[PDB]
């Protein structure tokens, strides 16, 4: 239903945008450091800041879809939840932040945007500073917005594997509900799937059950039912959304343990994030999955997802005077 | 034997560091960025370097004690294998690192320091990117000799705990080989040790075995025998002098899988790394170690190590002109 005109709009909006780069600045991006606003390509920070030395940070990515805002409050609640279970403080207050973001996404002209936000340690690391000497550091940034599956795979699906040489970080090393950029293992699982002539790799728990990817969460559907990992994964604003979207047609999702024998027998598959969305897998380890084609629940989840863009539950519209 | 010596010369260099201040604006540290060099506190990156942006670097630490360069080529050499490990290129020759090196001490006119190279994925990560496409950044920084034991505690013993609450991250996930800043795991340790009451962390692999603390190898003495983990570890230049050390000395030095078991029965324990050398952990979950005083072995491969500072098969002298 909705992919020839969400992918057309975006397409109208990203050449508006792209004429523009000669004469706006920040058509390419914009970025807040220490209280100033530069070009993104002309952000700098300190060397020895810790989230660089010790990469001690958690970051978090709301996004801008058609000039609106999507789920901005839960990114924020998030980052504020990941920085308690790191000891962080968000260094600015949290409608501070948002008037910023606000400000940041306006002054680019951008209406498909990622706008990250990093919160690091500062510039005295953990070991031996005293901790009332401990100052964390807050960067912020808007850019033109990333796809993981660009928009004309979306339409007949990607390839994964299920990675054989690397497995995700275990929750009792690195708690993967704090969106972290420490990405050894999945810059591992990306060169792995590479490596096999496929694109995505799905990570295991070193256990016999799927976890996460490099940069999103795995939902699979096998006789009408969503299923989806619980622990040790990041717990998805786009992976909530499919949630609300099931939940609205009717079609439950169980959020648990996956076995990797699910995979190779499920009927449809489908990433999420919010760099890029619902992004339907139909080959996996080289072989069709159920047929090679878009499954109906994918779609129904990839059209209920754009929806949401719209409504006012969970969007805002920007002002970009 | 060797501590009050080795500590008084450090002690007078420092005096003599710190009169340069006022007049060297590199005696606090120098960095290189992109060809040019800078006090370190001024030193700048960029923002969306994937070595911040996905913590997609290796790095590795020489040092420089009393003029004299430690060990250089085997950590040129380690930081070489863990760029190969993570298909990154050292940006330029080696020996034009080492001559740039050199010439960055001499103009700092440190004495005692840390020489820190980062190698990144660059500006553009791995995703998407094409692979010829991807110009891999180079960073390197001399600073002030840090101390992860400060001399001081060095003489009495520090405290430690097996943790608890966090363990090492595994191969599998991200290869300890590979010296990285992904610290996830390791400030979770420094954190747990210091709510119970203790300086260090020692993490386990989860399954019963020891592996490393927050920037050290971890060595235990029992009836006259090293034993130190083999897997889950950076295999670390200050281990490998301990082995040479203990070899010369006929002190066996067994590599090899170590329970957490051992750790409470042993005679003595020592920690390793290069910011600081070889030091002695005197209490373990509270309880002292085999009595609470720095053991004997202990001290013999204290004294070896830093008389294997001034051995021209180990070190070589700087010329600060």
């Given at each position: 239903?909705?992919?020839?005109?969400?992918?057309?709009?975006?397409?109208?909006?990203?050449?508006?945008?792209?004429?523009?780069?000669?004469?706006?600045?920040?058509?390419?991006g914009?970025?807040?450091?220490?209280?100033?606003?530069?070009?993104?390509?002309?952000?700098?920070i300190?060397?020895?800041?810790?989230?660089?030395?010790?990469?001690?940070?958690?970051?978090?990515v709301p996004?801008v879809?058609?000039?609106?805002?999507?789920?901005?409050?839960?990114?924020?609640?998030?980052?504020?939840?990941?920085?308690t279970?790191?000891?962080?403080?968000?260094?600015?207050?949290?409608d501070?932040?948002?008037?910023?973001?606000?400000?940041m996404?306006?002054?680019?002209?951008?209406?498909?945007?990622?706008?990250?936000?990093?919160?690091?340690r500062?510039?005295?690391?953990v070991?031996?500073?005293?901790?009332?000497?401990?100052?964390n550091?807050?960067?912020?940034?808007?850019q033109?917005?990333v796809?993981?599956?660009?928009?004309?795979?979306?339409?007949?699906?990607?390839?994964?594997?299920?990675?054989?040489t690397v497995?995700?970080?275990?929750?009792?090393?690195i708690?993967p509900?704090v969106?972290?950029?420490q990405?050894?293992?999945?810059?591992?699982?990306?060169?792995?799937?590479?490596?096999r002539?496929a694109?995505?790799?799905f990570?295991?728990?070193?256990?016999?059950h799927?976890?996460e990817?490099?940069?999103?969460?795995?939902?699979?559907?096998?006789?009408?039912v969503?299923?989806t990992?619980?622990?040790?994964?990041?717990?998805?604003?786009?992976?909530?959304?499919?949630?609300?979207?099931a939940?609205?047609?009717?079609?439950?999702?169980?959020?648990?343990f996956?076995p990797?024998?699910?995979?190779?027998?499920?009927?449809?598959?489908?990433?999420c994030?919010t760099?890029?969305?619902?992004?339907?897998?139909?080959?996996l380890?080289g072989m069709?999955?159920?047929?090679?084609?878009?499954?109906?629940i994918?779609?129904k989840?990839?059209?209920?997802?754009?929806?949401?863009?719209?409504?006012?539950?969970?969007?805002?519209?920007?002002?970009?005077?």
């Open positions: 239903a909705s992919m020839d005109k969400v992918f057309a709009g975006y397409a109208a909006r990203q050449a508006i945008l792209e004429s523009t780069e000669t004469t706006n600045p920040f058509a390419k914009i970025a807040w450091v220490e209280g100033e606003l530069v070009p993104l390509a002309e952000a700098r300190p060397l020895l800041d810790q989230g660089f030395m010790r990469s001690d940070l958690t970051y978090d996004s879809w058609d000039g609106r805002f999507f789920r901005l409050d839960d990114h924020i609640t998030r980052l504020e939840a990941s920085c279970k790191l000891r962080l403080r968000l260094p600015l207050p949290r501070q932040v948002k008037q910023i973001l606000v400000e996404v306006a002054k680019s002209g951008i209406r498909d945007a990622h706008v990250c936000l990093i919160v690091t500062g510039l005295k690391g070991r031996g500073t005293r901790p009332e000497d401990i100052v550091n807050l960067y912020m940034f808007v033109p917005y796809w993981v599956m660009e928009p004309d795979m979306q339409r007949v699906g990607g390839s994964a594997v299920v990675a054989r497995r995700r970080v275990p929750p009792g090393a708690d509900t969106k972290n950029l990405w050894g293992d999945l810059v591992r699982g990306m060169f792995e799937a590479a490596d002539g694109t995505y790799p990570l295991t728990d070193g256990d016999a799927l976890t990817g490099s940069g999103f969460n795995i939902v699979l559907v096998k006789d009408g969503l299923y990992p619980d622990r040790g994964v990041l717990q998805g604003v786009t992976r909530k959304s499919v949630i609300n979207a939940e609205a047609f009717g079609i439950e999702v169980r959020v648990e996956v990797v024998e699910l995979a190779y027998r499920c009927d449809e598959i489908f990433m994030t760099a890029g969305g619902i992004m339907p897998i139909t080959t380890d069709p999955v159920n047929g090679g084609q878009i499954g109906p994918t779609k989840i990839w059209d209920g997802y754009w929806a949401m863009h719209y409504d006012a539950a969970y969007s805002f519209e920007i002002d970009y005077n």
